Coordinates of C-alpha atoms in Angstrom, one line a residue:
Chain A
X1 CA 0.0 0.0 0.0
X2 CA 1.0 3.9 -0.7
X3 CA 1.6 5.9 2.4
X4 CA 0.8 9.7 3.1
X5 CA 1.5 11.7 5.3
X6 CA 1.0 15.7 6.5
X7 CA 3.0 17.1 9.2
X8 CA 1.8 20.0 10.9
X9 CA 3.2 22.4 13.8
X10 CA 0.0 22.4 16.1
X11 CA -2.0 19.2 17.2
X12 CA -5.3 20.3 16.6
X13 CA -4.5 21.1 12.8
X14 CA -3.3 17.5 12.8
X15 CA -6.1 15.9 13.9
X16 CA -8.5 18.2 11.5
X17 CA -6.0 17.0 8.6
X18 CA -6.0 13.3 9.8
X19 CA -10.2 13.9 10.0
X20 CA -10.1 14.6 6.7
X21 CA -8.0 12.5 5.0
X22 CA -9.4 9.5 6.0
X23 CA -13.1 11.2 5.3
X24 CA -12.0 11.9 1.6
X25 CA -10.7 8.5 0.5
X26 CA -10.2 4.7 1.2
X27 CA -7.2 5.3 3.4
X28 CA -6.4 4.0 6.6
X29 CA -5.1 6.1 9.5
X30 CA -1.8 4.4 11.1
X31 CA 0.0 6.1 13.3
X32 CA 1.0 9.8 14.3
X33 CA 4.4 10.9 15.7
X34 CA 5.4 14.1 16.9
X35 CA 9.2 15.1 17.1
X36 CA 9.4 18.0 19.5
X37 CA 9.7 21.8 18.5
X38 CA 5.9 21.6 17.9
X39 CA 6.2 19.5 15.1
X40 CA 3.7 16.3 14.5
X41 CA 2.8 13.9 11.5
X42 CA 0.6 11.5 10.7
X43 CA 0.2 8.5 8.2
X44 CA -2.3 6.8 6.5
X45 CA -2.0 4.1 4.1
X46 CA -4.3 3.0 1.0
X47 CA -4.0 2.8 -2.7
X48 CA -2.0 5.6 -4.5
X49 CA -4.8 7.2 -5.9
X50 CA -6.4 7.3 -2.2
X51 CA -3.5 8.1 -0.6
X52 CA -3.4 11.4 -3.4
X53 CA -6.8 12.6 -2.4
X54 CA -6.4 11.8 1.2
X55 CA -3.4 13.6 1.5
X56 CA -5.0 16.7 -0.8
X57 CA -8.2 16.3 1.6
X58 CA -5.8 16.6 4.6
X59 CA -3.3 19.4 3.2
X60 CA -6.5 21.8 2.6
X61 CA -7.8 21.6 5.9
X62 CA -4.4 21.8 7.7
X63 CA -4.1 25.2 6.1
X64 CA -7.4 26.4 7.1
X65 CA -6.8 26.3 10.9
X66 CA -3.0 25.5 11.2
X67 CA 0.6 25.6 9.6
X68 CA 1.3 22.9 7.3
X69 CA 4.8 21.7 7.5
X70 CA 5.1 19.2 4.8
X71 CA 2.8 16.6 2.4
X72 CA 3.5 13.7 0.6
X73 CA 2.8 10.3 -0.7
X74 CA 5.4 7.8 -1.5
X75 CA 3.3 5.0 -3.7
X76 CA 5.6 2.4 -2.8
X77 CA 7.9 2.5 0.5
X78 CA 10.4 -0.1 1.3
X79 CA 9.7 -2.7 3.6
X80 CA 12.2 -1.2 5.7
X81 CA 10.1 1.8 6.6
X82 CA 7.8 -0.5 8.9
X83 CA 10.5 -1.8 11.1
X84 CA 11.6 2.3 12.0
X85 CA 8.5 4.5 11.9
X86 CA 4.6 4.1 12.8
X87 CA 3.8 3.5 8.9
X88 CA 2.5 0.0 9.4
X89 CA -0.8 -1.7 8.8
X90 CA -0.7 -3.3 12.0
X91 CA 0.2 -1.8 15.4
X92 CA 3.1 -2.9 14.8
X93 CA 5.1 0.4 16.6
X94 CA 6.2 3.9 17.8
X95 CA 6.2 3.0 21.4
X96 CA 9.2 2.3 23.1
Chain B
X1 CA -20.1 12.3 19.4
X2 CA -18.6 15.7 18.8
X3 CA -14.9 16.9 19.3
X4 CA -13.9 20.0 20.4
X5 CA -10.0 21.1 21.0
X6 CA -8.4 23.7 22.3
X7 CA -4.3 24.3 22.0
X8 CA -2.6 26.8 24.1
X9 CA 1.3 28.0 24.8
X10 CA 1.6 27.2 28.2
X11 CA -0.5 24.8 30.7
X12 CA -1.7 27.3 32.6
X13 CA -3.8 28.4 30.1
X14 CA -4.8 25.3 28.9
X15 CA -5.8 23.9 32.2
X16 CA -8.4 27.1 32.8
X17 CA -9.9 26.7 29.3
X18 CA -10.5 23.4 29.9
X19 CA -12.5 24.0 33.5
X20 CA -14.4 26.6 31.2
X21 CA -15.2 23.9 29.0
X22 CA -16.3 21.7 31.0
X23 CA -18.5 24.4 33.2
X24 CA -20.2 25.5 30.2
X25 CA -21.4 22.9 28.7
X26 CA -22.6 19.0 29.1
X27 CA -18.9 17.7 27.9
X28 CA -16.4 15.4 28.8
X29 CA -12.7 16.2 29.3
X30 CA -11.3 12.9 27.7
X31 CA -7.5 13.8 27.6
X32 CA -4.8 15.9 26.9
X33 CA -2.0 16.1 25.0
X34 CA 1.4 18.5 25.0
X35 CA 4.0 18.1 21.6
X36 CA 7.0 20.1 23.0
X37 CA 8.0 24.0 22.2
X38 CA 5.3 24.1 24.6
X39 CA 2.2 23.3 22.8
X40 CA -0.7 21.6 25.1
X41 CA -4.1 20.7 23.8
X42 CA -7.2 19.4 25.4
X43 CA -10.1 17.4 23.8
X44 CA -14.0 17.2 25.3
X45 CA -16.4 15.0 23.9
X46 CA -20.2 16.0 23.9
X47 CA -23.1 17.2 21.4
X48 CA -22.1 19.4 19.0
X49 CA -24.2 22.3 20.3
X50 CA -21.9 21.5 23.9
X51 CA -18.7 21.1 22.0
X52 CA -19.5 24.8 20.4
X53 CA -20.1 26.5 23.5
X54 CA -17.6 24.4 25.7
X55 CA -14.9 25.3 22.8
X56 CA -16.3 29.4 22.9
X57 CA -16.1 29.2 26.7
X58 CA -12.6 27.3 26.6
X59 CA -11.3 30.1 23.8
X60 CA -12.1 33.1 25.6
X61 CA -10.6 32.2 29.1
X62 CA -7.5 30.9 27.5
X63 CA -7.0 34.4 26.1
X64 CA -7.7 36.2 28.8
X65 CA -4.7 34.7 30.7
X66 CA -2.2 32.8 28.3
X67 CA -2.2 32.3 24.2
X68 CA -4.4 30.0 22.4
X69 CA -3.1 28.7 19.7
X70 CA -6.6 27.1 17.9
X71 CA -9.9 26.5 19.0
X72 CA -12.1 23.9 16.8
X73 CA -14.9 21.7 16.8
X74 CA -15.3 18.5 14.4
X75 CA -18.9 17.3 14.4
X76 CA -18.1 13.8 13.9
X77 CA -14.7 12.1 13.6
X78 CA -13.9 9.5 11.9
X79 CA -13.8 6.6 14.4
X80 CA -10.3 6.3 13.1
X81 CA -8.7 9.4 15.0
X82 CA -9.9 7.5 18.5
X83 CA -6.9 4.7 17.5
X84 CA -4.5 7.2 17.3
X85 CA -4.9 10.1 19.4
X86 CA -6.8 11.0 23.4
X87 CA -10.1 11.7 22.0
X88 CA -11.7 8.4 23.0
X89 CA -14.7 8.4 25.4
X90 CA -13.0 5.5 27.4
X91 CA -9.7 5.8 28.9
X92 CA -8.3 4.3 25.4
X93 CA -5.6 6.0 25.1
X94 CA -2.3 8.5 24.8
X95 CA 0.1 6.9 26.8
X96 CA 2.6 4.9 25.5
Chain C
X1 CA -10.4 22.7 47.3
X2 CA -9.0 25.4 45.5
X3 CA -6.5 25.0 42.5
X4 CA -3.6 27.7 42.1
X5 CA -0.4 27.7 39.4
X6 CA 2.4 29.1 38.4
X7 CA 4.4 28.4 35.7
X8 CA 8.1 29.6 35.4
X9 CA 10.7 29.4 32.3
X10 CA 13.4 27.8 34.4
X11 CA 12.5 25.1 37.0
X12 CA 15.1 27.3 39.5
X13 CA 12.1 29.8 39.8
X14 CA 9.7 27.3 40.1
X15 CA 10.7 25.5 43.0
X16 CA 11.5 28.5 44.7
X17 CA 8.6 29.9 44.0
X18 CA 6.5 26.5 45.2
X19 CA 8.9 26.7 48.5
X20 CA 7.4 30.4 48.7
X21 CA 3.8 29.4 48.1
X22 CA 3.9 26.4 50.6
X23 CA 5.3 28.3 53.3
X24 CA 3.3 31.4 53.0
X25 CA -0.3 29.6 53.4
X26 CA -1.8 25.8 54.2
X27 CA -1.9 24.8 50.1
X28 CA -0.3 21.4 49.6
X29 CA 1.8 21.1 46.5
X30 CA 0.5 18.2 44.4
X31 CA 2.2 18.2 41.1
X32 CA 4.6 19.6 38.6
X33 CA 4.2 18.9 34.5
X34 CA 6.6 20.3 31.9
X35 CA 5.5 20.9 28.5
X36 CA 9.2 21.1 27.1
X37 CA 10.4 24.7 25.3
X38 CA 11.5 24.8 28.8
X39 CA 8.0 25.6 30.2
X40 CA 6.9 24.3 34.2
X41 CA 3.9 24.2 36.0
X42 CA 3.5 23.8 39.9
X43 CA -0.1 22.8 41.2
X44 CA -1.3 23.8 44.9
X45 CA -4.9 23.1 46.6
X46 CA -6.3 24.6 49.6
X47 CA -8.9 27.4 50.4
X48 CA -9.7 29.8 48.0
X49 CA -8.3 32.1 50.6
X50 CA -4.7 30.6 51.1
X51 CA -4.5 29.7 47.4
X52 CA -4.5 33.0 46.7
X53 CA -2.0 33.9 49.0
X54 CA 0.1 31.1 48.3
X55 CA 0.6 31.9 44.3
X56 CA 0.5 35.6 45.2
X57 CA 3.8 34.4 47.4
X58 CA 4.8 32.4 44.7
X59 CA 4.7 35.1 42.1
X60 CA 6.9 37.5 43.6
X61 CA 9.6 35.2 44.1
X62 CA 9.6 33.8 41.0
X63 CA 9.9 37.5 39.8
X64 CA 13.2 37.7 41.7
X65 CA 15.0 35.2 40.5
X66 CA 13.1 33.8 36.7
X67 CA 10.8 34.2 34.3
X68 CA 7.1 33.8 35.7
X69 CA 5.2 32.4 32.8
X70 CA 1.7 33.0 34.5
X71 CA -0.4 33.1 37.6
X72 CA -3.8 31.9 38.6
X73 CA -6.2 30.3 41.2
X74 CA -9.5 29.0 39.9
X75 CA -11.8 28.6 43.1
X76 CA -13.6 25.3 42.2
X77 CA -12.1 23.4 39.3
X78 CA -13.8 21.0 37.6
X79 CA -13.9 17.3 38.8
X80 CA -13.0 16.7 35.5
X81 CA -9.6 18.5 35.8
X82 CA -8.2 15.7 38.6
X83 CA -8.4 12.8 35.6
X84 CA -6.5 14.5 33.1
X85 CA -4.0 17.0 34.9
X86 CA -1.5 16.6 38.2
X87 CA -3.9 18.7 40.6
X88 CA -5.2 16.1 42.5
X89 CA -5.4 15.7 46.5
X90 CA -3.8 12.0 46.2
X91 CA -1.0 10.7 44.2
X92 CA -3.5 10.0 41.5
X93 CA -1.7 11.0 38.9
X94 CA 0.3 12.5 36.0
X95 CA 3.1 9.6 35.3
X96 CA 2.7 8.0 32.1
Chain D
X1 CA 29.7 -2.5 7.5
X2 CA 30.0 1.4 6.6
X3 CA 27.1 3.9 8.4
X4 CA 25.1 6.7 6.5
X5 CA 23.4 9.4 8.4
X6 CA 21.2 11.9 7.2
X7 CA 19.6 14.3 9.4
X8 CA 16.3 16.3 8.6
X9 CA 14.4 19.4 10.1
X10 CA 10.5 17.2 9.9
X11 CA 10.1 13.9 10.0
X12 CA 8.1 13.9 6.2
X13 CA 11.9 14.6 4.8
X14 CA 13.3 12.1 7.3
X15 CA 10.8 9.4 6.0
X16 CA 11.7 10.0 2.6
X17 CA 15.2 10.5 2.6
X18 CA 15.4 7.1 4.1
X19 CA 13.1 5.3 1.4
X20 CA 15.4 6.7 -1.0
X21 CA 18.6 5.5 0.8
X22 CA 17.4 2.3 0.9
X23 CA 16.1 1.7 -2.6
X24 CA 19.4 3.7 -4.2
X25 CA 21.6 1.0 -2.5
X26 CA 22.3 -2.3 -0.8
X27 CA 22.1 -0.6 2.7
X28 CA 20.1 -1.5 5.2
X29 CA 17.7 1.1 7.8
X30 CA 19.1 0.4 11.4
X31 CA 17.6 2.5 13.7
X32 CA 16.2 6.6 13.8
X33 CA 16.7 9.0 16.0
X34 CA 15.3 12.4 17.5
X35 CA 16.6 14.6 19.9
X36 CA 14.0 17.8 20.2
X37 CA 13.7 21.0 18.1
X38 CA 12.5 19.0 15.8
X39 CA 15.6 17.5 14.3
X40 CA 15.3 13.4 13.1
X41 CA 18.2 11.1 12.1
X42 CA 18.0 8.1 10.2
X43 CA 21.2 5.7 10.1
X44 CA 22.2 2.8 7.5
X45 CA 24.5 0.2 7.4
X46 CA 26.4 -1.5 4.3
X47 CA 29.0 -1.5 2.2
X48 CA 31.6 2.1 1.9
X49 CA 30.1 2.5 -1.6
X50 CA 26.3 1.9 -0.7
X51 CA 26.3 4.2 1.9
X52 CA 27.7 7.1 -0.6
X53 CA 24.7 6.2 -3.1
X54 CA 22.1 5.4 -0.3
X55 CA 23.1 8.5 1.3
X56 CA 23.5 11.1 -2.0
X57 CA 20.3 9.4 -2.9
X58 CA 18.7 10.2 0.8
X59 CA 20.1 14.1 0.4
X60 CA 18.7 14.9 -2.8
X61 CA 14.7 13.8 -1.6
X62 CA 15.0 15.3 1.8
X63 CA 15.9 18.6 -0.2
X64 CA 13.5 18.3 -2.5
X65 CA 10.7 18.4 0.2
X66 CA 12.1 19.4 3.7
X67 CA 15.4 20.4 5.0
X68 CA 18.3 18.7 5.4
X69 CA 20.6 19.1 8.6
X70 CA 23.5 17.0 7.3
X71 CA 24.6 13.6 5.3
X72 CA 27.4 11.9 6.1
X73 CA 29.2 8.6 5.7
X74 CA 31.3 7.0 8.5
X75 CA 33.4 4.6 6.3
X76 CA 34.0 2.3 9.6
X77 CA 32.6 3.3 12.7
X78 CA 34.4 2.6 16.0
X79 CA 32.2 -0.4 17.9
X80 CA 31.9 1.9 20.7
X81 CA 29.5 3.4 18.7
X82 CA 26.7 0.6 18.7
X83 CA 26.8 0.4 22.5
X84 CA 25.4 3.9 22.9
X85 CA 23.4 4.8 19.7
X86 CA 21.0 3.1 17.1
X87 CA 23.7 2.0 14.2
X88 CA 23.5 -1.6 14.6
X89 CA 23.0 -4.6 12.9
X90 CA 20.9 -6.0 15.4
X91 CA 17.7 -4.1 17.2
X92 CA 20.3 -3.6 20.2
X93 CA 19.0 -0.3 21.1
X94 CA 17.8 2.9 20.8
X95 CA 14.7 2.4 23.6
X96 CA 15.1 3.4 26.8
Chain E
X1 CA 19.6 20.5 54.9
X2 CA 19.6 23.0 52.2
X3 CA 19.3 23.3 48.6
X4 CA 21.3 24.5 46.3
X5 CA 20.4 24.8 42.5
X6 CA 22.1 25.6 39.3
X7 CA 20.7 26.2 36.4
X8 CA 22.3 25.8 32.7
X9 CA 22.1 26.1 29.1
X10 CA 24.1 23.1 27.7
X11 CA 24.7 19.2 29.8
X12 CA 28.4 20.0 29.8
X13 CA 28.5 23.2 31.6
X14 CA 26.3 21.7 33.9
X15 CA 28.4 18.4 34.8
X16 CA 31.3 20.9 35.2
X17 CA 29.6 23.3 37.2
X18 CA 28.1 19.7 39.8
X19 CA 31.9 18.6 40.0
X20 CA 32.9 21.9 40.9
X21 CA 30.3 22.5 44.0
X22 CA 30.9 19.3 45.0
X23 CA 34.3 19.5 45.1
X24 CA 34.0 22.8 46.8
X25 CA 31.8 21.9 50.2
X26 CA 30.1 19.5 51.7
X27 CA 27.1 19.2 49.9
X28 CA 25.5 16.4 48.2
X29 CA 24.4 16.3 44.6
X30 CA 21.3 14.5 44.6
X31 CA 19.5 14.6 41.8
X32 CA 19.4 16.6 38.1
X33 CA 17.0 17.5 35.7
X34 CA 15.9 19.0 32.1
X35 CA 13.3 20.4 31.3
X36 CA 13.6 20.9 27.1
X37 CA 14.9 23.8 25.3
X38 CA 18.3 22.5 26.4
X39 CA 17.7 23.8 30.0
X40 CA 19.0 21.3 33.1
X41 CA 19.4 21.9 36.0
X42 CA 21.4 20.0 39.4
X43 CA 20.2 20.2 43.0
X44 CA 22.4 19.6 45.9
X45 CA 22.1 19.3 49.8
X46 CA 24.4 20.6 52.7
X47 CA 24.5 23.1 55.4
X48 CA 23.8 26.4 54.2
X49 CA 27.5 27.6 54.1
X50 CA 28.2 24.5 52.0
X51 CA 25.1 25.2 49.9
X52 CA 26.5 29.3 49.6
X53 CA 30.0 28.0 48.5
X54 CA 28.9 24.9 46.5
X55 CA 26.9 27.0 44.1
X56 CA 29.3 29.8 43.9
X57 CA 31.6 27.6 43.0
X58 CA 29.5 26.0 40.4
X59 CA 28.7 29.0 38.9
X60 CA 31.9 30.5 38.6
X61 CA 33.0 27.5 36.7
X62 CA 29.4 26.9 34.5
X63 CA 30.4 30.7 33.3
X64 CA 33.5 30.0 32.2
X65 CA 32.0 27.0 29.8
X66 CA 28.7 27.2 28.8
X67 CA 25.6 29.5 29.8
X68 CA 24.2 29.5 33.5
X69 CA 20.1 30.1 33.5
X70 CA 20.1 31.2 37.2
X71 CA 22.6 29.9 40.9
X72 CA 20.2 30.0 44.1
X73 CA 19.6 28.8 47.5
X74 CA 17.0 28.1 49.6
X75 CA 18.4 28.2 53.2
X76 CA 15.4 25.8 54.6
X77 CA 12.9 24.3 51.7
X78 CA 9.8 22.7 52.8
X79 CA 9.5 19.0 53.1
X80 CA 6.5 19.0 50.3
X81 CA 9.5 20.2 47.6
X82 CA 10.8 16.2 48.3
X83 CA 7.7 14.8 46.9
X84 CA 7.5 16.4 44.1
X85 CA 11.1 17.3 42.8
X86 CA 14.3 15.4 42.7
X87 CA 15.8 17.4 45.4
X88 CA 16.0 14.2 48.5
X89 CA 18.2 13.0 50.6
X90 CA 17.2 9.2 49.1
X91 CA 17.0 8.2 46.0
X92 CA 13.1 8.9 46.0
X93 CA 12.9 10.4 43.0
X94 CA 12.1 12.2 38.9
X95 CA 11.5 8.8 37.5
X96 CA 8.5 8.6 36.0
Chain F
X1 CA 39.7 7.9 34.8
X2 CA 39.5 11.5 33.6
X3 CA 36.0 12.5 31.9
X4 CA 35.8 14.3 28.4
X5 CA 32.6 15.1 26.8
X6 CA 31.5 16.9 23.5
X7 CA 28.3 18.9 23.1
X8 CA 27.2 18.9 19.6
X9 CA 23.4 20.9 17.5
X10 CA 22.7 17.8 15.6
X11 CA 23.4 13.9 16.0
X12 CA 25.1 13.4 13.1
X13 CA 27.9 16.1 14.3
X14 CA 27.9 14.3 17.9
X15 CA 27.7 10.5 16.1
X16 CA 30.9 11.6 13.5
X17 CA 32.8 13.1 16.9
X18 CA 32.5 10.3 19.0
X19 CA 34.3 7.7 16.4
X20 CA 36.7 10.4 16.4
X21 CA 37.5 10.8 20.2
X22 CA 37.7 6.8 20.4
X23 CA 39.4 6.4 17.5
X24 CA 42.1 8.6 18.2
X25 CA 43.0 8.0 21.9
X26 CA 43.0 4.8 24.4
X27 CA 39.0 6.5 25.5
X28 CA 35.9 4.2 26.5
X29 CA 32.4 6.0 25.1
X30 CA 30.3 5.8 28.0
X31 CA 27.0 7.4 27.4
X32 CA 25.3 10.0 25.5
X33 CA 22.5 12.6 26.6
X34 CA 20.4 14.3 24.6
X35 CA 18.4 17.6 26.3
X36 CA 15.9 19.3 24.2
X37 CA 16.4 21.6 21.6
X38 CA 18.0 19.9 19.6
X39 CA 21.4 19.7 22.0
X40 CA 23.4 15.9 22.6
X41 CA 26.4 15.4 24.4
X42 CA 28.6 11.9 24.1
X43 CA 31.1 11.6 27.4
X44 CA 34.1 9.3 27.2
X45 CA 36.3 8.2 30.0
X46 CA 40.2 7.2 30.2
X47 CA 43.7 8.5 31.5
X48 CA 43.7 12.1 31.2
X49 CA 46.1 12.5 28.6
X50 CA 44.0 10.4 26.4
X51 CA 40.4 12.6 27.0
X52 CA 42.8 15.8 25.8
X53 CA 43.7 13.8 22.8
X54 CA 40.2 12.1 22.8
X55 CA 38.3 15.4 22.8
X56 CA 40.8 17.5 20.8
X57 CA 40.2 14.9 17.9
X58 CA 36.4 14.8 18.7
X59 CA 36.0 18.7 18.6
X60 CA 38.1 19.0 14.8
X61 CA 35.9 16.4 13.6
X62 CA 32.6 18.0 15.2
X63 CA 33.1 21.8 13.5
X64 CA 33.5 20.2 10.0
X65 CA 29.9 19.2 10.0
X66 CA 27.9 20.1 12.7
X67 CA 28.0 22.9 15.6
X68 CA 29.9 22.5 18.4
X69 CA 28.3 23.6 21.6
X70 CA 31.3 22.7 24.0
X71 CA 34.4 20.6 24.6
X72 CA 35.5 19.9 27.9
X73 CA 37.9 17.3 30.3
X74 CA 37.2 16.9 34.0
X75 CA 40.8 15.0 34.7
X76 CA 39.2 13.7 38.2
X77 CA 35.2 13.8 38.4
X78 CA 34.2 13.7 41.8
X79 CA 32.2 10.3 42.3
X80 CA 28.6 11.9 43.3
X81 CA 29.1 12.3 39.4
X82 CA 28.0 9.3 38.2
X83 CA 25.6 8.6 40.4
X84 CA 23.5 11.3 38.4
X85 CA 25.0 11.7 35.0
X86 CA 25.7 8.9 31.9
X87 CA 29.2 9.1 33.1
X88 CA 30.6 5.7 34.5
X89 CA 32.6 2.4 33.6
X90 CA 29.7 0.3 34.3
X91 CA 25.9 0.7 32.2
X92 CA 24.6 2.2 35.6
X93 CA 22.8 4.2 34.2
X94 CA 21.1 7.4 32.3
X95 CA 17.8 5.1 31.3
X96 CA 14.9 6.4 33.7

């Protein structure tokens, strides 16, 4: 599966983004992660063409009541990327 | 049922809007969560009529003694968003 | 019981000040939360009457020697606020 | 084995870089790392030339979408080094 | 006993300016803490002339390294400090 | 054994300085503490002559890719030292 994910500098723009991603396509909310400095992402997961309009969805509504930091799909990440970061379809991490 | 967030710079704040909230309205204080650079946001659950005047009550005493950073209701999250963050009508969540 | 704060930039003016609110009124200290950014918090309880001397102690020797953030009793906080925040009468909380 | 590093300001940039590494080269995604302020680390393992593609491969995406702090190759890192942070072949660490 | 407190900007200033009260009076360092934005902070106990020459000794010496936030003594802190900071004469505590 | 320790903006600067103290001197990398803000430290312990040579080698290596914060040897660290701080021959500690 894709992945997509918008980072934002404010929670609550976050959690409006994550709302609407997942309201906009067949994409599945995975995990969040916030790094300090204010700074927190999510990701979702679907096909590429959901993870497109989610992350569109989520990017548009960041803006409205936040500060988007970054957005982004990458349609096919290496395996890899599930053993380090909370981009996994099965709670598989980020808590340590 | 309804969500309705609040984000301040500093706790102090934050901790005020929230009795405000809560005093103003029928809705539930379900957690609260702080991302560093000292950002701190609270969640309520309730109708959406509550989560609108909880959310006004919570916005103007947070002002009056701190800095809100966003104020915002969502009608009706995705069931997705209690998974991954404290806005989950049952001790779910956020602590990990 | 009452609920008084303070928060400090610098944990040096904050446990001076708590030393200051503690010894200048009967308020028990019951918790401390950082937010990071380098932001903390000090929670009393007692009567309306001695929380407001207490942070009004606080305050002015925080002043001396920091940065005092903010300052401010609420007479009758929300049940609400004891599950969710460190200002609680017994050991209930805020460790996670 | 050789270590790659990048560093990114966002964890979007961060996740990229390192899909980027690991699909440019035989190098393998050990362990990640942040420490505040935002700033996010990815490390690699494999062999001196991989980690020059994996991480020239890492730079140029994090650019293109974030902002890098620094890339860098350690051609062969002390062992010391796997005691105390997450370059290592084996989930040894990093969680504390 | 007393307390003595150092504040600093920096981990290395701060371990210099510990070994230097230490070594300076009898006090005992008993416990350290940070509180993000790269403030940390050390607490020691003595008599109040060691606590007085302890943290002039440590600041002198953080100065001449690093960045001290703030040097100050309280000459008789209240017990209720011990439950909630890690200034105690046994291992009671700031690990949470 | 003398103490040295390196304070470095970034990881990858603090990561590429630590294979360069240990590398260059007979020094054992003890621990590594990170603070907020994006500021990590790396201590090393050995004879004294070797944490001059250690840290000397560890600072060039820092300011070629990173930021410095500070460099620093302690030739005889008082013991209370490692009772609090990730400096000490034997994993005691600096996990909480």
């Amino acid at each position: 599966e894709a992945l997509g994910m918008i980072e934002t500098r404010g929670l609550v723009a976050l959690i409006e983004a994550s709302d609407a991603m997942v309201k906009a396509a067949r994409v599945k909310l995975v995990g969040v992660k916030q790094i300090g400095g204010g700074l927190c992402t999510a990701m979702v997961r679907g096909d590429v063409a959901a993870c497109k309009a989610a992350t569109d969805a989520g990017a548009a509504a960041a803006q409205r009541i936040g500060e988007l930091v970054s957005v982004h799909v990458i349609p096919r990440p290496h395996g890899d990327l599930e053993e380090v970061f909370p981009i996994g379809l099965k709670g598989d991490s980020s808590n340590l």
